[PDB]
Design an enzyme around this catalytic site. Sequence first.
Site, PDB file in Angstrom:
ATOM      1  CE1 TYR A  27       0.854  -0.404   4.493  1.00 30.14           C
ATOM      2  CE2 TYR A  27       0.409   1.929   4.181  1.00 30.14           C
ATOM      3  CZ  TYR A  27       0.931   0.899   4.936  1.00 30.14           C
ATOM      4  OH  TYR A  27       1.543   1.169   6.136  1.00 30.14           O
ATOM      5  CG  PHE A  37       0.329   9.576   5.245  1.00 34.10           C
ATOM      6  CD1 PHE A  37       0.098   8.513   6.105  1.00 34.10           C
ATOM      7  CD2 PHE A  37      -0.658   9.919   4.331  1.00 34.10           C
ATOM      8  CE1 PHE A  37      -1.085   7.789   6.039  1.00 34.10           C
ATOM      9  CE2 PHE A  37      -1.844   9.198   4.257  1.00 34.10           C
ATOM     10  CZ  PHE A  37      -2.056   8.132   5.113  1.00 34.10           C
ATOM     11  CG  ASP A  38       2.619   4.205   6.264  1.00 33.13           C
ATOM     12  OD1 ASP A  38       3.840   3.953   6.304  1.00 33.13           O
ATOM     13  OD2 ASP A  38       1.757   3.436   6.731  1.00 33.13           O
ATOM     14  CB  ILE A  57      -8.577   3.471   9.161  1.00 32.80           C
ATOM     15  CG1 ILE A  57      -7.910   3.143   7.824  1.00 32.80           C
ATOM     16  CG2 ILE A  57      -7.747   4.433   9.995  1.00 32.80           C
ATOM     17  CD1 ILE A  57      -7.714   4.365   6.927  1.00 32.80           C
ATOM     18  CE1 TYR A  83      -5.002   7.187   9.529  1.00 25.25           C
ATOM     19  CE2 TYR A  83      -4.402   7.021  11.836  1.00 25.25           C
ATOM     20  CZ  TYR A  83      -4.308   6.560  10.541  1.00 25.25           C
ATOM     21  OH  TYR A  83      -3.503   5.480  10.259  1.00 25.25           O
ATOM     22  CG  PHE A 100      -4.885   4.240   2.025  1.00 27.95           C
ATOM     23  CD1 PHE A 100      -5.829   5.006   2.688  1.00 27.95           C
ATOM     24  CD2 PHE A 100      -3.694   3.953   2.671  1.00 27.95           C
ATOM     25  CE1 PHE A 100      -5.588   5.486   3.969  1.00 27.95           C
ATOM     26  CE2 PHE A 100      -3.444   4.425   3.958  1.00 27.95           C
ATOM     27  CZ  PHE A 100      -4.393   5.191   4.605  1.00 27.95           C
TER      28      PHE A 100
END
Length: 108
Positions: A27, A37-38, A57, A83, A100
């Site tokens: 991902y 961010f990730d 999530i 979030y 994502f």
Amino acid sequence: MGVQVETISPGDGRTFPKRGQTCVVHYTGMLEDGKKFDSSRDRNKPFKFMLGKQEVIRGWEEGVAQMSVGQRAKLTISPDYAYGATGHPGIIPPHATLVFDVELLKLE
């Protein structure tokens, strides 16, 4: 809103994750402006989670369940499925819609 699933490449169209199965994914996570961010790909190691255990999530719980094995899909997730109002200090701002890129490699 919830989670919107937009296909990128098709999977087998037949094998969908059931509750209690472990999903193995690659991902990449971005903010709505496109800032990453990730990403599991940058670590060169797939990410594993068990569906229905709230290890991810809510947008992932309900979005990955709609993907078939081998599919790559774009998940757009509203803050309530993400979030929320709080966000995450220094990574995810308040009230953030997240995008994502997710590839479901296999189920264990």
